[PDB]
Structures are given as structure tokens and as C-alpha cells.
Write an enzyme that holds these catalytic residues in place. Sequence first.
Site, PDB file in Angstrom:
ATOM      1  N   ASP A   1      23.042 -12.537  69.817  1.00 47.54           N
ATOM      2  CA  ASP A   1      23.981 -13.307  70.693  1.00 47.54           C
ATOM      3  C   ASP A   1      23.464 -13.780  71.817  1.00 47.54           C
ATOM      4  O   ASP A   1      22.820 -13.006  72.824  1.00 47.54           O
ATOM      5  CB  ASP A   1      24.848 -12.256  71.061  1.00 47.54           C
ATOM      6  CG  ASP A   1      26.470 -12.925  71.631  1.00 47.54           C
ATOM      7  OD1 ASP A   1      26.928 -13.452  70.699  1.00 47.54           O
ATOM      8  OD2 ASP A   1      26.642 -12.943  72.716  1.00 47.54           O
TER       9      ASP A   1
ATOM     10  N   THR B   1      27.428 -19.405  71.935  1.00 50.49           N
ATOM     11  CA  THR B   1      26.828 -19.297  72.890  1.00 50.49           C
ATOM     12  C   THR B   1      25.316 -19.405  73.170  1.00 50.49           C
ATOM     13  O   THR B   1      24.880 -19.594  74.208  1.00 50.49           O
ATOM     14  CB  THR B   1      27.243 -17.744  73.496  1.00 50.49           C
ATOM     15  OG1 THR B   1      26.144 -16.925  72.752  1.00 50.49           O
ATOM     16  CG2 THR B   1      28.447 -17.494  73.100  1.00 50.49           C
ATOM     17  N   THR B   2      24.774 -19.684  71.901  1.00 48.47           N
ATOM     18  CA  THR B   2      23.323 -20.082  71.817  1.00 48.47           C
ATOM     19  C   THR B   2      23.065 -21.679  72.063  1.00 48.47           C
ATOM     20  O   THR B   2      22.105 -22.359  72.599  1.00 48.47           O
ATOM     21  CB  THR B   2      22.606 -19.593  70.852  1.00 48.47           C
ATOM     22  OG1 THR B   2      22.780 -18.109  70.950  1.00 48.47           O
ATOM     23  CG2 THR B   2      21.092 -19.772  70.881  1.00 48.47           C
TER      24      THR B   2
ATOM     25  N   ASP C   1      32.259 -11.720  67.374  1.00 43.67           N
ATOM     26  CA  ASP C   1      32.093 -13.057  67.102  1.00 43.67           C
ATOM     27  C   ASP C   1      33.013 -13.586  65.804  1.00 43.67           C
ATOM     28  O   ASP C   1      33.602 -14.753  66.027  1.00 43.67           O
ATOM     29  CB  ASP C   1      30.784 -13.578  66.677  1.00 43.67           C
ATOM     30  CG  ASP C   1      29.821 -13.688  67.962  1.00 43.67           C
ATOM     31  OD1 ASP C   1      30.199 -13.078  69.135  1.00 43.67           O
ATOM     32  OD2 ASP C   1      28.750 -14.162  67.972  1.00 43.67           O
TER      33      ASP C   1
END
Lengths: 528, 535, 130, 52
Positions: B72, B105-106, B403
Amino acid sequence: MMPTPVILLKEGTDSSQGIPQLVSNISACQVIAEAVRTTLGPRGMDKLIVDGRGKATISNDGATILKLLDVVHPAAKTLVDIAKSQDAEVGDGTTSVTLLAAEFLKQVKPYVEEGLHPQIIIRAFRTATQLAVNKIKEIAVTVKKADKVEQRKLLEKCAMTALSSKLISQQKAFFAKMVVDAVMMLDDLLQLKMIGIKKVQGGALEDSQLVAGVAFKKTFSYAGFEMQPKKYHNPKIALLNVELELKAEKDNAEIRVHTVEDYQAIVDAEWNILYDKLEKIHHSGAKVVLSKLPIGDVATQYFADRDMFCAGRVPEEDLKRTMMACGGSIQTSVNALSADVLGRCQVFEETQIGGERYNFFTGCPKAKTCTFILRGGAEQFMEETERSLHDAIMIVRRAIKNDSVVAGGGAIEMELSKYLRDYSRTIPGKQQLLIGAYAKALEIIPRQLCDNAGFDATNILNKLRARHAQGGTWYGVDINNEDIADNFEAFVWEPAMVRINALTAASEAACLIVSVDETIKNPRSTVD
Amino acid sequence: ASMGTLAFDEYGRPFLIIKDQDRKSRLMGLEALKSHIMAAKAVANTMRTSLGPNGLDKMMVDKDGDVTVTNDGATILSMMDVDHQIAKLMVELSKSQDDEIGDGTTGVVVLAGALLEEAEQLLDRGIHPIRIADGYEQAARVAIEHLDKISDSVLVDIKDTEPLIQTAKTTLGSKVVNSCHRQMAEIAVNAVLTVADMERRDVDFELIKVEGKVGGRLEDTKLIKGVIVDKDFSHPQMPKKVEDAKIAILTCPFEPPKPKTKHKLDVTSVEDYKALQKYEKEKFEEMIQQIKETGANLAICQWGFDDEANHLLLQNNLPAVRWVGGPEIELIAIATGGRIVPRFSELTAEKLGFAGLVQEISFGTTKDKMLVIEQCKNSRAVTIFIRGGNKMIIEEAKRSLHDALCVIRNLIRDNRVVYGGGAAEISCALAVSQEADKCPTLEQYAMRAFADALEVIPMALSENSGMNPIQTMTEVRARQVKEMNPALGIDCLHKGTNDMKQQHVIETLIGKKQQISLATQMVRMILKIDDIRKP
Amino acid sequence: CSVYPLTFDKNENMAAKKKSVAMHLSACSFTNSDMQILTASGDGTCALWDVESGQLLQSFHGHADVLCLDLAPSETGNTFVSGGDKKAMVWDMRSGQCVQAFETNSVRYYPSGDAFASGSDRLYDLRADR
Amino acid sequence: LLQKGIHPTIISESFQKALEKGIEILTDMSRPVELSDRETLLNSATTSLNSK
Ligand SMILES: Nc1ncnc2c1ncn2[C@@H]1O[C@H](COP(=O)(O)OP(=O)(O)O)[C@@H](O)[C@H]1O
Ligand SMILES: Nc1ncnc2c1ncn2[C@@H]1O[C@H](COP(=O)(O)OP(=O)(O)O)[C@@H](O)[C@H]1O
Ligand SMILES: [Mg+2]
Ligand SMILES: [Mg+2]
């Protein structure tokens, strides 16, 4: 200098006197102005300041940047103070004041080095500033018909102009319309505490919304809260300042019994007191219960059993906004909960906004308050969005007070400089040089605009001067086309009081700085 | 240039402007932009290796030596000890993407790093950073419109969860739980669907309890349509299993009552002592009989109780559990359909919850017992119970399941999806390139840089999968241009095809739009900063 | 830290008897009913003693070392909170188990009983575990 | 170029090819000069000194 075995002042006293200290003060003012130059204009840039704790503040606001700076120079603090004064009185122009004051001092510095008496410079500044303020009031454009449509257009244009220098300038039309809509709903005093500013992380700028009512974050729900319904279609809101918990009747209260029957009676009496308060609340017909004081788990479960909503520890400002929107009254006692003191909203709902739970009170037709919900990718991002919206709100409020606008982009200052030069060319000549220096210093803002935008300042200034001399009042710097244009026709509108206050404060600061001839610094006490 | 200006006046007199100005630093102008772009590039290049199914985890260590292995991006950046302000801005951007969406989020960090990397070479050519930000905003608007155009809708009905399962699988593919991929997707979809307001309203994550326990296997993870509890029956001799249990939820300790107000009870004679003793005994008997009167087969309390109540509960065939936490009390009340009763006198039959099975669970040679409540009638609360070979994969599974739950929540909010695998970014880059041709020359460079930065996601996916990035991305873009198909992406798993519809690689439209918007806003904010005044 | 002298230097005021054997100390605190004394050491165990009989009733180990002990006055058996670890833990001595925990030196129990201070080197409501 | 995934050996050979092509182009663009022409020498010297 002589040893003077008994010294007059305390050891370590530092004294600077004469022309050199005045020149040093002017240079310090220039240094302070240099720190906020690049923040001016639609092509401005933000400054990042880190305090000792490690926190960083990112701002395009001149007053904020100056405040975060730890200025210790006695003469330099005047610029910070006048920036604060401009922020307080008007709310915009906190960079223009510093630039104008520093440019005044820079222009009069060569005359200071020549031995000119400071009183002459002060008198010239006062005369020039009075004439400039009179000219601003004379040539400011106002319309004496005051219709809703044109007033709305003027407010929106002023808000866009005040907003087209910040990081939200891409959405400036949206934000300005929303700000004007929020401001127009205030009743008579335009209190800033009646406009809520909620910053919720995550989400784009276009996701930010204005609530036609009140909205606040969920406040520490107790057990049994999740069983309460989270949507109502015609709720009555009970605004209370009451602690609905099982607790001691009073801090100094004491119960003395000598029989188990009285013990059970006392326990049942406490329970009956709590249940009587709850029943009095319930029988009022209200469905939403908000309290300034904590609401216990017993009360939460009691309200859940009745399909009722409860929320304790609501902050003071949120309750005040709820009262002003729904139209109730905050009750410290529940003994008389009539329909008069009960709020009313069309729709109440608890929704999720970027990982947070927010309670919404919408559909209020006669609300006198508003709530801003700002979305952004960072804490300082939302903080600077709030600062920009505050600037726009202040400008819109001032425009509501008086719709006297002048064209921005340096057009007003070019007109003032031309007028002041024309006045100065018709006087003996000792004051003529100083008034001409004042007029030349008035050119700083358009030059700074061109420099920040990357133009050639000299050519733009020459074109502006020629155009103003040959006829034309609202011709200023056109940033997009790298040229000059009619800023009034370009809707670059500024309230006249902004420039009035800027000139007044800059002149007062320059006069105060020039008036000082000696600075004395006492030795430090309790250095530790 | 650095530390500020140090002149000490032109007359030799001291020139002090800012307190401790000799100990402060300052970066002025373009070099500040270069340093910020460099820091953002470093952060993005660190993150980019953990993108896609073939991404590799970062193994974080905190200040106390605790080890976290995760993919994450938001978690990695949150646990990363940075000092640079732009790095903190990137961390805040990741946290914002996690808060708003919960997935991608990456990608936001990589996109922002690519945008700033292109802005660097744009700045070197003499373009004002505000112009770059405006061009980036224009291209972002174009890309958002193109995503809205090429988006596809899926059915969110409970009678056909196949698109939801596929979307959850796409979300979970990059995580370590891809071994149990389909089971994880199924349990996440069922957990979200079971607790959700059907009228396209919010999904309350407070009613999804995620608990992890060591031991067992990762495949032992299951969805419980009830509540798992980290407690057990109070008396060791009560039965460990109750079936068709009538549940009484109570928040009053099974103790003699006491007023909240400061109270003193006076004993002035032997008769008073006898009366007090009889009153205590009768209070215990009365509370137990009141509980038994409702017909309940089980009692759950929150505040514990003493020995006499314990023995009376055991003696009347009333299994009970004590010291159940407030949130667990609420979850049990919601799931079992029963109310919360504050005192015994108010306990009636209609306030009793129902559960088809209440059992005590052992966990091997660990002495730990954990209660389970399930087989409810129409339970509105669910629990995800995670098992694993060590705590670290358990935490990773927890955040991966979070997620997946967030992605299904996004589908609940909006049912429009865009096929992933880099197809969306490639199509947006193509649209931006086509729009830039009609645009005047000056903003063309900014829009082309935006398109090039958008194309880094397929390049990163190809790099992580071992393929040649430039060749594969160019071939896929040429195929997308030739045949009208915005669903052609990077074959990360080497399934033999580039069409993501057959591969069922599905991403939420809201997620991609949020990614692009947040990256553009953060890039603009970073580009607008020109001075730093660290102490 | 506060250790009173040995001989008590008095004239038999029926309070010179003090036990104070100190067989365990960092958080010695007398309970509501004086018949029990609660003490803790650096071994991560909380020890409860009966002052009259003079033997360890039952030891509590659920933590590293424990530092601060505070007791909620109810029979001295209801609850007592330990915040030694960064883990505020509440124990019930009618069962000898950690009833609830908070993973977050000078913990103070609020007089109301619904919450307790957790001053370290927050008002945690017991009714909501937050 | 390296970030795109190109080995830093194809880059070297391609740069050599570009250098050879650019040398050809520069030679094509050049103009003959003779030392008897004082004006060209003066212009070259002035151009050299223009930046000092
Ligand atoms: N669209 C525009 N075109 C030209 N000038 C503008 C425009 N918008 C704002 N300005 C100029 O920016 C100046 C103010 O900059 P700003 O940073 O917004 O406020 P402050 O005066 O507090 O620095 C004004 O003098 C105004 O003339
Ligand atoms: N089976 C797959 N084939 C090709 N690409 C995939 C596949 N699964 C996921 N991806 C891509 O990997 C990228 C990264 O996803 P992931 O690592 O799960 O989360 P994040 O977006 O936060 O990095 C996504 O943009 C997605 O398009
Ligand atoms: Mg302004
Ligand atoms: Mg993902």
C-alpha cells in the site's frame, strides 16, 4: 569617547543616530518588501516558511508571510504592522501596502542622503496622499440604480479579481460565485462566524461545496448510535445545552439515608430524573437532538429506541450556526420545549466525505448562515484555499457596504501617478521633487506585475504612461496578452477602499519611519 | 543565494532584520523548483517499483523496530520518516487518495513525479511555472472528460455479483493475498453488499469489523454474518455452545445498585445490618429472576459482575459473557435484532435478540477463547476474520481487504468503470495529444508533457513485468490508435492478449478521476512554491 | 520514592503498625478498603496483597515493565488501571483478566468513573473505548 | 533515454551515428575562407571578443 567611570546608561546599551541609521531603516524596509515581491499578481508564487517545530506554512498572502517571519528590526516591524492593519480593515492588499511603503522610502532615500530635512518629506507625503485619496474617491466608478442583477455581477467580478492570484485561480469563477452566494445570505452584520469553513482532506477543488444550511463533523458517538436512523424528511431539531447523563445532581450534593427502601428510592429517583428529561425532549416532537454538553450512552440508546437522532458535544459555533439556519433557540432547560424554540430543516442526513462522517442540515429556506466544505490533497492546500476564500469574502463584504470600484492591474495607480506628477509640476520646487518621487513610487505595482509575469517592465510602463497621458483611465497591465488593455472592460475590478487604505497606511508608515532620527536599544534582561 | 542576505550595513553598524537570521537558510527562485522536483522524483521513483501485479513490497521499520511488509503506497509513505517538505506533501497526497477512494494511492505519487519531471525540462526551456500549471490543468480536464466518455457501467445488483467480484479481484491482484484472490474478492463483495444502504447511499465501515488472529492458514479467512468477540463465557462450567439463543444485551453490571451522587447509607442497629444483608441477597435474586423471566437463553453485559451473579447465572442455565466492549455491544445488538437495555427492570421479551448459534472457539495450544455469534435472521453487520502464518501477512491482508471494501464502496457510489492495465492512461494520453494539436503553440508543450507523464503508468507496468517499457507501450498505443479500442493495456500477467475486457481488469472511474485530479492539484501547488525558509 | 522512617517515632497511637514488608516497587498505592495493597515492579507484573493476612492474593501479568497504577474505588476488586509498553490496561480481580486495553506514567482515574486520564512522557472513555 | 528502458550501449552507438551525421551537416554548411581576406579574420576576432 571616554571611559566615564560612572557610565550614564546601563552597560550594553546600543545607540545609532543620524543619517546612517535612517538609511539603514530604509534598507531594512527594502529587505522586508523583497520577501513578498513575487507573491503579487496572477503570476504570483507561494512562499514556504518552516517554524522551529517543523511545521510548514505555504501562503500567497502577504500578511501571513510577514507574520510568519520573525522580524526584529524596529523599523521593519512597521511594514508588518501596516500589513496586519490592511488585513484587518480591508482584507486584501497586504502586499501592496508593503511594496508601496518600501518604494516611497526607496524614492526618498537619495534626498535623505543629501541632508534634506525629514519634516519636508513628511509634509510632502501627507499632501500627496491626501490628493491621491481625493482623486480615488472622485474617479471611482459607481452606479446609482442598484439592481440585483448588476450588483451580483459586480460582486462576482470583484471576487474573481481578488481570487485571481491564488492557487484556486483556475476555479476562480466557481469559487467567486459560491462566495458571493454565501455572503448574500448573511442578515445584517455580515459576521464571519456565521460562515463556516470545513476542511476535509481528499477530493478535488471542484468537489468543494457550499451548504445552504449548516454541516459539522460527527462528534464522538456513544454505543447504540449506529441504530439511529440517519435520514429525516421533515425533522424538528431540538437545540439544547444540557448534559443528558446519569450523574451526581450537584457537585456539593450529598445523600444521607438510613433504610434500604430509601436507597432503592434514591436510585430510582436518579433514573426517573434522567428519564423525565428524556421524555420531555421526546414529547416535544423533535427528531434530531443536538447538545453542547455530553450525551451519555443511556440517552443515546433511549433515542435510538424512539427512532431519534442524538449528537452531543457539538461545538459552540456549530450550534450557533444551526440556530441561525433552522431557526430555533438553545435551551439550557427542557421544562418548556415549545414549538417556538425548536429548529426546522427540510432534510437532515449523515453522509461520508473523504473518510469522515458529516451531519447535514439542508433545505432551510430562511437560513442566515452558510458552511463551506473544502476538499484538497493536503493540509496546507486546504489552509491556503481557506485564506483565499477569506480574502474574497472580505472583498465581497466591503463591496456590499459600498459598490465603488476602480480598475485593477495598476491602472488606478498609473492614473494617480499622472495626476500627482501634473500637480507637482505646478509648485515652487522643493515639494515638487518629493511629490514627483511619490508619483514615481506609485509605479511599483505594475512594474512588479510585469516582473512576476516575466514581461519587460520598462516597455509596458512606457506604454501605460503614454496611454494615460494621451487619455484613458482604466488602462492597466494585461497579463495574458503581455500587453496593456482596458482593465475596467476586462472586469479587473477592485473596491476603492482597498487602494484608499493601502495608500493611507503606506504613507503613514513611510512618515513614521522617516520621522525617527535616533534608535536606542537597551541591554537584554534575563537572557537565560 | 543561501542563508539570505548578510550585509551588516554600508556604515559598519549591525544590520539585524530577522531573529537568528545567521542560523536560517533560504532558497530563492528556480533552484527551489529544481530541488522540489528532484525530491518528488526521488519519492515517485521509490514508489514506482510497487505498482501492478508484479510490484514488490516495501518492508518498513518504525522507530521501535516493528516491521511492516506492505504494498500500500499510502501506508508506505505514512510510515516513511521524511524531512523534506515536498516529501511530506507527497505523503499527504497519498493519504488524501486513500481517504477519498481507498485505492490507487501508489499511482498518484508516480503520476505526480512524472508530471514534475516533465515540468523540470519545461522550466529549463524558459516557461513560467504558472503556465505549466495552467497547461496541466487544461490537459487534466481533457483527460477527465475522456475518462467520462470511455467509461462503462456495471450492474451492482445482489443477484449477479460477477462484475463486482472481478473488480475486487483486480484491486487485490497486486497484493500478497492473490493466492486466495477469488475467496478474498468474494468475501469483500459479500461484506460490502450485506451492510449497505441500497438506495445508492453510503456504506458505513463501522459495521464491518475486521479482526485478525495468528495461526491457521490464509485460506481460513471467512466472512461471518454476525459478530466475533474476543471474550468467552464468564463461568468456566457453562456450556460452550448455545443454539437458537435468545440474547439479552445489558449495560448494567450485575451488582447491587448505587447512586451516582455522593451517598452514605447509615447502619444504626443490628436490624439495619440484617435488612442490608437481606436487601443485597434479594437484589441479586431479583436481577437473576428478572433476566430469566424474559425467556432469554444468553446474557451479554458490558461492565462485568461479581461471584454471586456468576453462580446464579450458572445455576439457572443462563450462559453469560462479561466485559463486552461498547462497539461490540452495538454490533451484537444490530446483528441479532435486539435492543440495548440499561437496567433489568426494563428488560422485556421484545428487546431480546436472536442468534442461531453462539459458540466458543479454541485456537490450538494457546489458551485463548473467542466467542462467535452468527446464524442471525437478517443481520445488518458482518465480520471479517483473518487467519495467517504470522502477524505481518495478517496486517497486509487487513489492509488489502480494506482496499477491496473501499473499491466495492466506490462501485456502490458510482457504477461507472474503466478498464485498467494502463489502457485508461494510454487513451487519456492519446486524447490529450489530439487536443493539443488544435491548441495554440504555447500551451502545446505543457499538454504534451502532461500526456508523456500520463504514459508513465504503462511504462512502469511493463518495467515491473520485465517487458521493454518503450517498445511495449508504443505497440499498445499504436494498436489503440489503429483499431477503435480504449481497452488495450499492458499484459502484465502474460495471458497472451492485450485486451483488458477479456482479462477482466476493471478499475473504478471515480478512482482514476480522483487520481488525475489530485495529482494535478498537488503538482500545481508544488510548482507555485518558489521560496523555502527552513531554520 | 516516599519511604517513611522505620521506628515511627511515636507513642503507640494504634497506627505504628504498617506492614510495608516490600517483597515486590514503583506504584505502591493503598486501596479503597485498607485490607488490600497493590504494588508493581519492573518485571511487568502487578501484584495484589492482602495487608492483614500478608500474602500475595494474585499477580497480574499482561504487559514490558509496568510503571503507573491507579485504582477505581469499588470494593478494591472491581477494576484497577495500569499504564506502564504504551498500553493502558484495565483489570478485574473478580476474574483476574484484562477487561479492556488501549494501545496509545501518570495515568489518573477520573472521579466519574466513565473515563480516565492517561498522561504520558487523554480522556479515554470506558463506554466507547476511544 | 535510460528511464525509457534503453541499454547505455545502443545510446552510445546512436550518438556516434548522430555525431557523424552532424559533422557532415556542419561541413556542408561551412564556407571556404582564405587568409588573404582581412575582413573575415576581423569578423571572427570581433565575434570571439563579443562575449568578453
Ligand atoms: N486579472 C488581472 N489582471 C491584471 N492584474 C491583476 C488581475 N488580478 C489581480 N491583479 C492585480 O493583483 C494585485 C493584487 O494581488 P493579490 O496577490 O491578489 O493581492 P495583494 O494585493 O494582497 O497582494 C492588484 O493590484 C491587481 O491589480
Ligand atoms: N491483471 C492485471 N493486468 C494488468 N494490469 C493490472 C492488473 N491488475 C492490476 N493492474 C494495474 O496495476 C496498477 C496498480 O494497481 P495496485 O498496485 O493494485 O494499486 P495502486 O494503483 O495503488 O498501485 C493499476 O493501475 C492496474 O491498472
Ligand atoms: Mg488580493
Ligand atoms: Mg490498487
